[PDB]
Enzyme design. Structure first.
Site, PDB file in Angstrom:
ATOM      1  N   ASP D  50     -36.457  13.075 -72.703  1.00 52.72           N
ATOM      2  CA  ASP D  50     -35.077  12.531 -71.952  1.00 52.72           C
ATOM      3  C   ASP D  50     -34.392  11.471 -72.839  1.00 52.72           C
ATOM      4  O   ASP D  50     -35.099  10.361 -73.271  1.00 52.72           O
ATOM      5  CB  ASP D  50     -35.194  12.090 -70.575  1.00 52.72           C
ATOM      6  CG  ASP D  50     -34.080  11.885 -69.880  1.00 52.72           C
ATOM      7  OD1 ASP D  50     -32.754  12.040 -70.361  1.00 52.72           O
ATOM      8  OD2 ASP D  50     -34.150  11.231 -68.631  1.00 52.72           O
ATOM      9  N   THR D  83     -26.746  12.138 -69.896  1.00 52.79           N
ATOM     10  CA  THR D  83     -26.556  10.742 -70.465  1.00 52.79           C
ATOM     11  C   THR D  83     -26.439  10.798 -72.026  1.00 52.79           C
ATOM     12  O   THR D  83     -25.599  10.004 -72.568  1.00 52.79           O
ATOM     13  CB  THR D  83     -27.744   9.809 -69.898  1.00 52.79           C
ATOM     14  OG1 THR D  83     -29.015  10.441 -70.545  1.00 52.79           O
ATOM     15  CG2 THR D  83     -27.612   9.836 -68.267  1.00 52.79           C
ATOM     16  N   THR D  84     -27.112  11.660 -72.571  1.00 51.35           N
ATOM     17  CA  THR D  84     -27.060  11.956 -73.999  1.00 51.35           C
ATOM     18  C   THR D  84     -25.822  12.158 -74.430  1.00 51.35           C
ATOM     19  O   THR D  84     -24.981  12.334 -75.541  1.00 51.35           O
ATOM     20  CB  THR D  84     -28.199  12.983 -74.451  1.00 51.35           C
ATOM     21  OG1 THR D  84     -27.770  14.023 -74.119  1.00 51.35           O
ATOM     22  CG2 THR D  84     -29.461  12.449 -73.990  1.00 51.35           C
ATOM     23  N   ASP D 366     -36.245  20.002 -64.204  1.00 51.36           N
ATOM     24  CA  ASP D 366     -34.994  20.584 -64.475  1.00 51.36           C
ATOM     25  C   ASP D 366     -34.354  21.927 -63.574  1.00 51.36           C
ATOM     26  O   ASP D 366     -33.257  21.816 -63.495  1.00 51.36           O
ATOM     27  CB  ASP D 366     -34.889  21.164 -66.243  1.00 51.36           C
ATOM     28  CG  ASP D 366     -35.124  19.806 -66.995  1.00 51.36           C
ATOM     29  OD1 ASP D 366     -34.344  18.865 -66.788  1.00 51.36           O
ATOM     30  OD2 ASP D 366     -35.395  20.021 -68.115  1.00 51.36           O
TER      31      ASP D 366
HETATM   32  N1  LIG Z   1     -30.737  26.562 -70.970  1.00 51.96           N
HETATM   33  C1  LIG Z   1     -29.728  25.995 -71.148  1.00 51.96           C
HETATM   34  N2  LIG Z   1     -28.784  26.698 -71.986  1.00 51.96           N
HETATM   35  C2  LIG Z   1     -27.737  25.678 -72.569  1.00 51.96           C
HETATM   36  N3  LIG Z   1     -27.478  24.708 -72.314  1.00 51.96           N
HETATM   37  C3  LIG Z   1     -28.426  23.913 -71.664  1.00 51.96           C
HETATM   38  C4  LIG Z   1     -29.758  24.542 -71.141  1.00 51.96           C
HETATM   39  N4  LIG Z   1     -30.267  23.522 -70.541  1.00 51.96           N
HETATM   40  C5  LIG Z   1     -29.856  22.261 -70.724  1.00 51.96           C
HETATM   41  N5  LIG Z   1     -28.279  22.814 -71.355  1.00 51.96           N
HETATM   42  C6  LIG Z   1     -27.671  21.627 -71.683  1.00 51.96           C
HETATM   43  O1  LIG Z   1     -28.165  20.136 -71.917  1.00 51.96           O
HETATM   44  C7  LIG Z   1     -27.429  19.174 -71.583  1.00 51.96           C
HETATM   45  C8  LIG Z   1     -28.181  17.942 -71.041  1.00 51.96           C
HETATM   46  O2  LIG Z   1     -29.323  17.998 -71.514  1.00 51.96           O
HETATM   47  P1  LIG Z   1     -30.341  16.663 -71.633  1.00 51.96           P
HETATM   48  O3  LIG Z   1     -29.618  15.787 -72.776  1.00 51.96           O
HETATM   49  O4  LIG Z   1     -31.649  17.140 -72.342  1.00 51.96           O
HETATM   50  O5  LIG Z   1     -30.914  15.964 -70.483  1.00 51.96           O
HETATM   51  P2  LIG Z   1     -29.574  15.142 -69.713  1.00 51.96           P
HETATM   52  O6  LIG Z   1     -28.850  16.087 -68.699  1.00 51.96           O
HETATM   53  O7  LIG Z   1     -30.364  14.194 -68.757  1.00 51.96           O
HETATM   54  O8  LIG Z   1     -28.675  14.465 -70.573  1.00 51.96           O
HETATM   55  C9  LIG Z   1     -26.359  19.704 -70.261  1.00 51.96           C
HETATM   56  O9  LIG Z   1     -25.048  19.421 -70.793  1.00 51.96           O
HETATM   57  C10 LIG Z   1     -26.538  21.352 -70.569  1.00 51.96           C
HETATM   58  O10 LIG Z   1     -25.351  21.938 -70.995  1.00 51.96           O
END
Ligand SMILES: Nc1ncnc2c1ncn2[C@@H]1O[C@H](COP(=O)(O)OP(=O)(O)O)[C@@H](O)[C@H]1O
Ligand SMILES: Nc1ncnc2c1ncn2[C@@H]1O[C@H](COP(=O)(O)OP(=O)(O)O)[C@@H](O)[C@H]1O
Ligand SMILES: Nc1ncnc2c1ncn2[C@@H]1O[C@H](COP(=O)(O)OP(=O)(O)O)[C@@H](O)[C@H]1O
Lengths: 62, 77, 77, 500, 104, 52, 75, 52, 67
Positions: D50, D83-84, D366
């Site tokens: 994360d 947050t990223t 998730d």
């Molecule tokens: N299976 C998936 N397919 C496409 N995009 C995804 C998928 N899972 C997560 N994401 C993308 O990842 C982004 C955020 O993921 P991440 O940075 O790992 O965690 P956080 O949500 O805490 O920032 C989201 O904006 C989402 O669009």
């Protein structure tokens, strides 16, 4: 020039030159500042060829 | 470690294992003259080997996914 | 008791400790196995392969190896 | 501080600091992103995919770094999903307007352009946002299961994903009461297979050496209760302290059945070797309990707290439904379940592999975030690098319409909105550049919801792929990113005040 | 049976590894300029002489290198250019890859 | 062809011939990496097509 | 130079010469004994005798020097 | 360097190739039959063939 | 610098060809070079850049001869 393409009725908006007397956008076909077609065509071609030739050169390291 | 030719023994033992399925066809490190490993009374726990493989795979996978180390590299005198 | 500097070496140290207090023997096996895994992993990386698929294939391979180990088991008193 | 003078050079320094702080977290976006391990003093290097978790452990010293981390922390506190995205988006804004600050573009112009572009983007997302909440939400929960399946799509746990998704959404639909990370606390257990994993409506903890000494507890008791005791329970003036020890030992036995307590809680060790002295109690004991366990038990039905030597209350054995203590995997586990308000869910992480802790953290959490955001929110759009393309396309089209200074700035803004698919597909590992061109063509001409697929690493109409993103959360994230960018751009100089 | 030859001496082996490393340095400095899809090389002279081209053997004539292995790779490339006149860039790349294989 | 020959040349020299083939196989990989598209793909479909 | 066994071949050739086989030498192809006449490994008598005599003479010359004295180095 | 003009230059270049060789009996092609001037500046589209 | 020599002799070639426009061709060439260098630091292999530039030039001249 966005309206020249997005708006099909604004066909006669394609020659907004630069009136250097005041530095304001202005109709230029009426103004009359003209450039030969061959001049611009060859200028663009030569600029693109020079860009290609320079970009095609990287066989040093510095 | 011993000194025998590795790859010829490798191929020969692989061919014999193809001929007969046996976890007792391997290197004769003590030069006993036989590749029948069971005949040489060598026993190790299977749990140890499976845990070895699983741990090695997990550690390698983890290292494959890490690309961040910070160093000052000031070359102090 | 090695002068470990990079965290990867320390991770291998905890790998060895986990294998040692889990079994006791074969602690050399995990280190050499990881060494060879990385041996071919670095050429695979040089070919231009991102680590995710390498890790997935390695985990599939580990499952295959564990299944073979279970298949060729033999127990005594 | 090099060339940290009043005016533009200090802004350039702040932008560079923002770029550096982005680089650390630039590679962990998405579910298939690499993890970071950096030395943090005494060698307790932490594995955390994360990006926010990376943020809490950074070494930010530049004022720009701190004033970006605070925005990131605020966004994280507001919602945990994304947050990223906000930090990297703000960094892209900053680095794509950096080639304009040096020409003499006064920062107020950039502030105005950013605010108007943000307003345009908010209008565009509002006019395209699609509501699918009515589509069989209360009944026919199969859509929620399909949405949760995205969290483990084309992965080694996909075979077991269906049952897990079904039963977690079953737990959530009666626990849709503003859940969070602490409310749903899972526990890891070794042995067995991964298929029979379950989620009890309570807690789960192991009777360690310092947890419980007494065994064969009365499991089938329908009036459990927690009794918090702040005193020890385990076993020529020397005779004086001997008599004091005997008196204390005798006195500590009067809070077993005279006070009527079945479970005793204490912060001092409970001797397993002293079980023969704990056997007379014939009552369960719990020591060195986590604060998570304390809060979950308190919210479940509410345990009593004793302060004095012989403190006694009427809630010593009050109303809780039933007690459970079942051995799992050959070892006895304690389950403080059976409570009228047991609004907790503990997952029994059945599985042979001990190192799958991070894998289940990145899968199940998730998935339950996905189901919670699907239930709580109503309007979602197909993103995963698709909605950002829509916003960028609309803003770039609108840029050519308006004359004035802000045209170029809105163009740079739209060019900066394209970074999310870039980073997502790069973290996937595919050729980022081809993905961009393919997305742009198939989006400008083809459709408004064509997004990336992390499985086969190619484009897909993400509306059919069911890659949903809550509209309101996305709006808040974009607003926060724009606000952070504006705040940074509107700054000229720091004030040091080192000593006097 | 059992053990064969002890093979006590090892230093010339690692010296040969160093030679192969130099040969690969030259090789991957040369590799890029192959094919229409390819891009010219990346090599700067220590003295400062400059050439700019896409045919490999010209770059092979650029370098004033120390290691004899690189010099004889230059000889190989120019010999191939003399003999046939095409594929000279390929020859050096093949040679370097073979040297790394010999390493392994 | 050299790979399958090394498969049929079982011995100490078999892996030497295999590495010879692998190292020589770089020129199409160079052309493909010049094109951006996956050289590993390029060569695996090349292998399959030449086998067919 | 080929990584073959030393002591085993030394003993084998010792035994072969013990039976009188003045033609039993090593073969790099197999690392065993053979007939150098049949195997084609032949050497000139004069060249070998000159080599042996020159080696002995040079060794004798070197062993007869005891002390080496160095003047002031020019560098 | 002549990539796009390779198709353009191929006919004229080949025709100049048969000009300095015998396409019937000459078993070897002399590389010294053709000389090149390094004219500072110019464009490939201005290809000029000289027989003198 | 040799790159400067190349650019200035292309400029002289353009001047000898059509006359006016030397400043424009030099400026456009430099802008293209710096933008393409930024885009190649954006991890784009230069031959795709060259092909795109050639296609863009063809489309531009066809547009000019049309509008
Ligand atoms: N299976 C998936 N397919 C496409 N995009 C995804 C998928 N899972 C997560 N994401 C993308 O990842 C982004 C955020 O993921 P991440 O940075 O790992 O965690 P956080 O949500 O805490 O920032 C989201 O904006 C989402 O669009
Ligand atoms: N039009 C083309 N399409 C595909 N491959 C080509 C083309 N032209 C040349 N090649 C490849 O380029 C390789 C090297 O040719 P070239 O560079 O002319 O020789 P050298 O490497 O000696 O300069 C050849 O193996 C050939 O297959
Ligand atoms: N009256 C005018 N108003 C605006 N622009 C002009 C005018 N006259 C010439 N120009 C501009 O000057 C440019 C060409 O001048 P320039 O290339 O500097 O000449 P030279 O090549 O002789 O140096 C053209 O692009 C044209 O737009």
């Amino acid at each position: 020039h966005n309206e020249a393409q997005v708006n099909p009725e604004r066909k006669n908006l394609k020659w907004i030159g630069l009136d250097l007397s005041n530095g304001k956008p202005r109709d230029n076909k009426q103004a009359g500042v003209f450039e030969p077609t061959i001049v611009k065509v060859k200028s663009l071609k030569f600029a693109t060829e020079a860009a290609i030739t320079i970009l095609r050169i990287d066989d040093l390291i510095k | 470690n011993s000194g025998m030719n590795p790859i010829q023994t490798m191929t020969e033992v692989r061919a014999r294992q193809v001929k007969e399925m046996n976890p007792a066809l391997g290197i004769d490190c003590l030069h006993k003259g036989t590749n029948d490993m069971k005949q040489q009374h060598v026993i190790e726990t299977l749990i140890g080997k499976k845990q070895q493989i699983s741990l090695a795979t997990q550690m390698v996978r983890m290292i494959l996914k890490i690309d961040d180390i910070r160093k000052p590299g000031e070359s102090e005198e | 008791m090695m002068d470990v500097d990079h965290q990867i070496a320390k991770l291998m140290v905890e790998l060895s400790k986990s294998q040692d207090d889990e079994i006791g023997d074969g602690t050399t096996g995990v280190v050499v196995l990881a060494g060879a895994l990385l041996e071919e992993a670095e050429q695979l990386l040089d070919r231009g392969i991102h680590p995710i698929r390498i890790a997935d294939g390695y985990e599939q391979a580990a499952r295959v190896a564990i299944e073979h180990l279970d298949k060729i088991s033999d127990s005594v008193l | 501080g090099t060339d940290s003078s009043q005016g533009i050079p200090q802004l350039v320094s702040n932008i560079s600091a923002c770029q550096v702080i982005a680089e650390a977290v630039r590679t962990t976006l998405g579910p298939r992103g690499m993890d970071k391990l950096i030395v943090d003093g005494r060698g307790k290097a932490t594995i955390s995919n994360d990006g926010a978790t990376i943020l809490k452990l950074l070494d930010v010293v530049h004022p720009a770094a701190k004033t970006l981390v605070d925005i990131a922390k605020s966004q994280d506190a507001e919602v945990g999903d994304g947050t990223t995205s906000v930090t990297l988006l703000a960094a892209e804004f900053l680095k794509q307007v950096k080639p304009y600050v040096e020409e003499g573009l006064h920062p107020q112009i950039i502030i105005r352009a950013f605010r108007t572009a943000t307003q345009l983007a908010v209008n565009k997302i509002k006019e395209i946002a699609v509501t699918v909440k009515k589509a069989d939400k209360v009944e026919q929960r199969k859509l929620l299961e399909k949405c949760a399946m995205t969290a483990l799509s084309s992965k080694l746990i996909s075979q077991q994903k269906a049952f897990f998704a079904k039963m977690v959404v079953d737990a959530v639909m009666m626990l849709d009461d503003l859940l969070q990370l602490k409310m749903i606390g899972i526990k890891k257990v070794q042995g067995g297979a991964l298929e029979d994993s379950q989620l009890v409506a309570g807690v789960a903890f192991k009777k360690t050496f310092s947890y419980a000494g007494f065994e064969m507890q009365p499991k089938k008791y329908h009036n459990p209760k927690i009794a918090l005791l702040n005193v020890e329970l385990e076993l020529e003036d020397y005779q004086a302290i001997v008599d004091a020890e005997w008196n204390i030992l005798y006195d500590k036995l009067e809070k077993i059945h005279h006070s009527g307590a079945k479970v005793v809680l204490s912060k001092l060790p409970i001797g397993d070797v002293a079980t023969q002295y704990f056997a007379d109690r014939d009552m369960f004991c719990a020591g060195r309990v986590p604060e998570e366990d304390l809060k979950r038990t308190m919210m479940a039905c509410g345990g009593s707290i004793q302060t004095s030597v012989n403190a006694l209350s009427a809630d010593v054995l009050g109303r809780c439904q039933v007690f459970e203590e079942t051995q799992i995997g050959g070892e006895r586990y304690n389950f403080f379940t059976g409570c009228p308000k047991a609004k907790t869910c503990t997952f029994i992480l059945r599985g042979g592999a001990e190192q799958f802790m991070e894998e289940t953290e990145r899968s199940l959490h998730d998935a339950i975030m996905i189901v919670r955001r699907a239930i709580k929110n109503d309007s979602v759009v197909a993103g995963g690098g698709a909605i950002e393309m829509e916003l960028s396309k609309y803003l770039r089209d609108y840029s050519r319409t308006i004359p004035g200074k802000q045209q170029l700035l809105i163009g740079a803004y739209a060019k900066a909105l394209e970074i999310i698919p870039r980073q997502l597909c790069d973290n996937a590992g595919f050729d980022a550049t081809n993905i961009l061109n393919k997305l742009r063509a198939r989006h400008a001409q083809g459709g408004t919801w064509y997004g990336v697929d992390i499985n086969n690493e190619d484009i897909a109409d993400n509306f059919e792929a069911f890659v949903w993103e809550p509209a309101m959360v996305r709006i808040n994230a974009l607003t926060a990113a724009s606000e952070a960018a504006c705040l940074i751009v509107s700054v000229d100089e720091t004030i040091k005040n080192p000593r006097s | 049976r059992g053990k064969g030859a002890y093979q006590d001496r090892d230093k010339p082996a690692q010296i040969r590894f160093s030679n192969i490393s130099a040969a690969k340095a030259v090789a991957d400095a040369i590799r890029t300029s192959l094919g229409p899809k390819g891009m010219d090389k990346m090599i700067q002279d220590g003295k400062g002489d400059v050439t700019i081209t896409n045919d490999g053997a010209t770059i092979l004539k650029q370098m004033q290198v120390l290691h004899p292995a690189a010099r004889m790779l230059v000889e190989l490339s120019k010999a191939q250019d003399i003999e046939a006149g095409d594929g000279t860039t390929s020859v050096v790349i093949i040679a370097g890859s073979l040297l790394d294989s010999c390493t392994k | 062809r050299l790979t399958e020959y090394s498969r049929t040349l079982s011995g100490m020299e078999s892996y030497c011939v295999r590495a010879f083939a692998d190292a020589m196989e770089v020129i199409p990989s160079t052309l493909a990496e010049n094109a951006g598209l996956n050289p590993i793909s390029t060569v695996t479909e090349l292998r399959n097509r030449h086998a067919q | 130079n080929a990584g073959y066994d030393s002591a085993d071949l030394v003993a084998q050739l010792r035994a072969a010469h013990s039976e009188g086989n003045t033609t039993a030498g090593l073969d790099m192809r197999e690392g065993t004994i053979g007939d150098m006449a049949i195997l084609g490994i032949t050497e000139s008598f004069q060249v070998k005798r000159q080599v042996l005599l020159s080696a002995a003479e040079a060794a004798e010359v070197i062993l007869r020097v005891d002390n080496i004295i160095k003047a002031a180095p020019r560098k | 360097v002549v990539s796009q003009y390779s198709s353009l230059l191929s006919p004229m270049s080949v025709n100049a190739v048969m000009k300095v060789i015998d396409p019937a009996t000459a078993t070897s092609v002399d590389l010294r039959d053709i000389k090149i001037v390094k004219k500072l500046g110019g464009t490939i589209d201005d290809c000029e063939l000289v027989e003198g | 610098h040799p790159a400067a020599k190349v650019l200035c002799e292309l400029a002289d070639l353009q001047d000898k060809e059509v006359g006016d426009g030397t400043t424009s061709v030099v400026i456009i060439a430099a802008e293209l070079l710096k933008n393409a260098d930024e885009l190649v630091k954006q991890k784009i292999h230069p031959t795709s850049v060259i092909s795109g530039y050639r296609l863009a030039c063809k489309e531009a001249v066809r547009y000019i001869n049309e509008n």
